[PDB]
């Protein structure tokens, strides 16, 4: 049986403030820039539709230097931090970014048509761009988040598999890391393994996995450590309706239509796909630059940061403007030529985080020791995530008890 | 005279929690995939615009194993379950799906025109796609739902009927089953019997019946067993305005126009039809992933699940993204060819259900026995739906009295 943390955790009246100064990231919005001979990255990939996972490290309160010590007994008490307030400051102006493919697989525009496509070609690919759906989300926890996507499965060995067959599909749960791609209006699938022509989705997702958070599995966890708080807001609509070009994997049944003649002797493509569009960004619909108070979590864990560790996941596509840069090769010409200038694309992104923490103490009795050991063995030993990449935040040297000297501390003292 | 269940049913203070783990369905969005020689289905049809009817089976509380028994007298008491809270968890990201026909009967675009169509052809069919209207609905009851549609009637035998005559129309009430089609913006009619050219509506409804729930008949039922609770939300608008091609069944009267000459010697088609469009999906307009509390039903039945049976009907077109898959036939070519790849379409859909139930007891006196026998004869015998198809849910082995160990039980205990 799982019990709430409010039973075996005692909260004191000591509060601390923590915060980062400013985080910046500048890079190419579509692909990394790499040296031709080498494999070392010169310009990383920074996009507005990437998961931002911050892993925050806290001081050990047992070894922390407090002006007063009489409030607890080190012989039978142990200390831990609790989160009571978070703000995610978000710079840059509001904007919308677009992406596309120079060789995207589009056959025809089927929204309105007046002639029939009676002849097939060798290459019908086009240069198409669009803007993605609108999404904001924030997740806070003490364990890394969990996402889901569609991937290939293991086929049965009863019958053989011929080239060109439909791959089998299964649903896969993984851990979201820093730099992953969010859904853009095409689904949560592995585009590298489920698409072979490399020309069906834009350039920044054509060789990546799009993942969606697994809210149902996260909230059903018995201990509720992976999610203390979450906000989400997403929207989209359809702008264009197209076809796809290729060979027909599955034929239309003969009892759904009447055969034609002349131009309509053969059938056109039935692999319709839409073009997504986020509508419009406004200041009134923003979930950032606002303080969140963590009064009572939904799960049994109520903001206790076991292991001196915090995880913050952020997605915000409402500031995704890409900047165009131009450099002149030769300036000794008074008439414009296309070949005298070079074009570049850049994206910059700005972050700020600030937190209010409360000090708690735990009495280690035999029953409490047994329960905590059953919950997590490493906690007692201290008194794994080495193959994942997160944005590391080190707050071991940024705490202050002067709570009213900071913007978030003033609000915290004002609400109470 | 019909009396409320609150008079002859006594409620105890015992609550139980039930829930399914996860339900998945993957298939083709338009038609089933079948072997050519055989008639057995390989890939079923899974679409975002299908009725989902879950038939849920509960344990018999008379034979159920309770830790305590003294709260009722088996010599004169009988037990039954009552529903007090339901949540329908809904996975996958928000999206919009589209559908169309490769040989759809469209003549001209009449929104804006500059030339007159003075010549008729043999085949003027086009490849047209669109996106449907937006609809969400949830219905809960203890009997299967009832729907209505337009169908053919029996003509009078006074005069003969010639080929090409207009079929007679009547309104027909039936039972909604799992896999039926919801209205998409073209009406609630039988497209198989009322349309003969097979080219007027897209491929996933051209040989199906679209049904609409019969709310007026459901709420007028004397006992109110078919509907305890319901939510609905639908919206659409018009994108395109077209004509139809064919022979004219009914001529325009000569007193509504002045005859033309030259290009306008004959009249163009007056069988105008619009193209529907659901507008836009947002997180703020969602009715799912929210708990429903059944405090007081509208009808006389107040959540009592007679016969240990429940029915849940769900429609949700706000997650209807179709995934495109591509398979390579030969990989020994460095230049792209259309004939070297095969294209497929898939749709996957995810469900979760969770319920809170209360235990009730009934005293069987002579008047109560007579009333219940008049209401339903099978109830006394226990102390029909074999020709319908539902998604069967078996909760006979998933109850637990530990109510706070689950996400919905925590909310239930929090609200009270």
């Amino acid at each position: 049986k799982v019990v709430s943390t409010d039973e075996y955790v005692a909260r004191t009246n000591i509060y601390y403030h923590a915060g980062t100064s400013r985080l910046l990231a500048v890079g190419h919005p579509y692909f990394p820039i790499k040296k031709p001979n080498n494999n070392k990255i010169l310009v990383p990939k920074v996009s507005g539709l990437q998961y931002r996972v911050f892993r925050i490290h806290l001081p050990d309160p047992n070894k922390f230097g407090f002006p007063d010590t009489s409030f607890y007994n080190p012989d039978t008490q142990r200390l831990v931090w609790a989160c009571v307030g978070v703000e995610v400051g978000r710079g840059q102006p509001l904007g919308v970014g677009i992406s596309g493919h120079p060789l995207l697989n589009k056959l025809d525009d089927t929204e309105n048509a007046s002639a029939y496509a009676a002849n097939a070609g060798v290459d019908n690919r086009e240069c198409i761009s669009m803007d993605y759906k609108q999404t904001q989300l924030c997740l806070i926890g003490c364990k890394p988040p969990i996402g889901e996507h569609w991937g290939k499965g293991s086929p049965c060995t009863n019958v053989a598999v011929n080239p060109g067959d439909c791959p089998p599909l299964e649903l896969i749960n993984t851990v979201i890391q820093d730099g992953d791609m969010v859904d853009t209006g095409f689904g949560a699938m592995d585009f590298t393994t489920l698409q072979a022509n490399k020309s069906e989705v834009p350039l920044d997702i054509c060789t990546s996995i799009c993942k969606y958070p697994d809210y149902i599995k996260m909230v059903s966890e018995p201990y509720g450590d992976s999610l203390f708080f979450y906000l989400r807001r997403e929207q989209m609509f359809v702008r264009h309706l197209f076809n796809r070009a290729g060979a027909v994997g599955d034929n239309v049944p003969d009892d759904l239509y009447i055969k034609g003649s002349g131009s309509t002797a053969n059938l056109a493509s039935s692999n319709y796909f839409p073009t997504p569009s986020g509508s419009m960004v406004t200041s009134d619909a923003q979930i950032f630059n606002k303080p969140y108070w963590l009064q009572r979590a939904q799960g049994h864990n109520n903001g206790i940061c076991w292991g001196n560790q915090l995880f913050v996941t952020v997605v915000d596509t409402t500031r995704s403007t890409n900047m165009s840069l131009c450099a002149a090769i030769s300036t000794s010409e008074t008439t414009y030529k296309n070949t005298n200038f070079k074009e570049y694309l850049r994206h910059g992104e700005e972050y700020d985080l600030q937190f209010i923490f409360q000090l708690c103490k735990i009495t280690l009795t035999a029953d409490v020791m047994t329960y905590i050991h059953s919950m997590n063995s490493t906690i007692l030993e201290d008194w794994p995530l080495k193959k994942y990449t997160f944005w590391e935040v080190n707050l071991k040297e940024k705490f202050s008890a002067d709570l009213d000297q900071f913007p978030l501390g003033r609000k915290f003292l004002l609400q109470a | 005279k019909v009396v409320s269940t609150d008079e002859y049913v006594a409620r105890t203070n015992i609550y139980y929690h039930a829930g399914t783990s996860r339900l998945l369905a993957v298939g083709h969005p338009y038609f089933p995939i079948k072997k050519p020689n055989n008639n057995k289905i390989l890939v079923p049809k899974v679409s975002g615009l299908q009725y989902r009817v879950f038939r849920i089976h509960l344990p018999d509380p008379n034979k159920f194993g309770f830790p305590d028994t003294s709260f009722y007298n088996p010599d004169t008491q009988r037990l039954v379950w009552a529903c007090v809270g339901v949540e329908v968890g809904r996975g996958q990201p928000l999206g919009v799906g589209i559908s169309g026909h490769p040989l759809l009967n469209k003549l001209d675009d009449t929104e804006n025109a500059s030339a007159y169509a003075a010549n008729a052809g043999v085949d003027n069919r086009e490849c047209i796609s669109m996106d449907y209207k937006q609809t969400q609905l949830c219905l809960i009851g203890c009997k299967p739902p009832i729907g209505e549609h337009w169908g053919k009637g029996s003509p009078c035998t006074n005069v003969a009927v010639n080929p090409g005559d207009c079929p007679p129309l009547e309104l027909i009430n039936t039972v909604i089953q799992d896999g039926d089609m919801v209205d998409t913006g073209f009406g609630a009619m039988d497209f198989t019997t009322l349309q003969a050219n097979k080219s007027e509506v897209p491929l996933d409804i051209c040989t199906s019946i679209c049904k609409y729930p019969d709310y007026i008949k459901m709420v007028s039922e004397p006992y109110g067993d078919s509907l305890f609770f319901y939510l609905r939300r639908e919206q659409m608008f018009v994108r395109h305005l077209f004509n139809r091609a064919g022979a004219v069944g009914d001529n325009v009267p000569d007193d509504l126009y002045i005859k033309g000459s030259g290009s306008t010697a004959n009249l163009a088609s007056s069988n105008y039809f619009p193209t529907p469009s659901g507008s836009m999906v947002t997180s703020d307009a969602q009715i799912f992933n929210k708990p429903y509390w059944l405090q007081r039903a509208q009808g006389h039945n107040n959540g009592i699940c007679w016969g240990n049976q429940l029915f849940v009907t769900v429609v949700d077109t706000t997650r209807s993204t179709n995934m495109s898959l591509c398979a390579a036939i030969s990989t020994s070519e460095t230049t792209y060819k259309n004939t070297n790849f095969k294209e497929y379409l898939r749709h996957g859909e995810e469900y979760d259900l969770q319920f809170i139930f209360q235990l009730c007891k009934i005293t069987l006196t002579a008047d109560v026995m007579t009333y219940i026998h008049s209401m339903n004869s099978t109830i006394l015998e226990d102390w029909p739906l074999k020709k319908y198809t539902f998604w069967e849910v078996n909760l006979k082995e998933k109850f637990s009295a530990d109510l706070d160990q689950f996400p919905l039980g925590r909310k239930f205990l929090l609200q009270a």
Epitope: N119, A120, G121, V122, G246, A247, V248, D250, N251, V252, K259, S261, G262, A265, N266, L267, A268 | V122, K337, N338, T339
Partner: antibody, heavy 122, light 107 residues
């Protein structure tokens, strides 16, 4: 240029099934539409079936439905024709006709096989 | 399907003459007609497609014309290598069909 090569002569008994192949040898083909024709002793030409893998087309004449199957393999660029329930009137010479992608229509059958003799007798 | 009738079924000509063959369709098939030449011991060979267009590598002495239900093939200045069997073919529907065939012989 490209040449289509067919399999050898076949001798079958009534009630059996036969299968004939058609392979493109020179260059790279990238076939467009495949069809089969036959000629009986002392008769004309008879169309027996067409497949167009793009557009997903597969059509046979009414007198031949249920007994004829036409298949194409793009990895090896080989066409196959299957006849079931052979009769004594199926003794004939069979021709493979194919069209190449990049032409102006699907019915520009400019490539033909040499023909295969099939004799159904006991 | 569509039935096609080819006339005549046989004719004799001399070197340097003009030969015309008429072809008739059971329905309107626009210009979806092709003409094939067949010699003994060889495969059929395409000459005219779409009832007017001339295949590459074919002498200009061959011509074809027609539309609707009536079509015709003309050969001017007959040469010794032109003596073969000629067939119609409709491609209006995906269920193609051939004509009866006309055999040209030596006078």
């Amino acid at each position: 240029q490209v040449q289509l090569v067919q399999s050898g002569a076949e001798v079958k008994k009534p009630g059996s099934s036969v299968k004939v192949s058609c392979k493109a040898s020179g260059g790279t083909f990238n076939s467009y539409a495949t069809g089969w024709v036959r000629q009986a002793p002392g008769q004309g030409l008879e169309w027996m079936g067409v497949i167009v893998p793009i557009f997903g087309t597969e059509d046979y004449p009414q007198r031949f439905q249920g007994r004829v199957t036409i298949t194409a393999d793009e990895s090896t660029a080989t066409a196959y024709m299957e006849l079931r329930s052979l009769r004594s009137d199926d003794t004939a010479v069979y021709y493979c006709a194919r069209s190449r992608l990049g032409s102006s229509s699907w019915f520009l059958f400019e490539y033909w096989g040499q023909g295969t003799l099939v004799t159904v007798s006991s | 399907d569509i039935q096609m009738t080819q006339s005549p079924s046989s004719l004799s000509a001399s070197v340097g003459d003009r030969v015309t063959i008429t072809c008739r369709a059971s329905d309107m098939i626009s210009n979806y007609l092709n003409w094939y030449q067949h010699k003994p011991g060889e495969a059929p060979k395409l000459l005219i497609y779409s009832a007017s267009s001339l295949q590459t590598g074919v002498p200009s002495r061959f011509s074809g014309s027609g539309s609707g239900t009536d079509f015709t093939l003309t050969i001017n200045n007959l040469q010794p290598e032109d003596f073969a069997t000629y067939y119609c073919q409709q491609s209006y529907i995906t269920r193609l069909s051939f004509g009866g065939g006309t055999k040209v012989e030596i006078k």
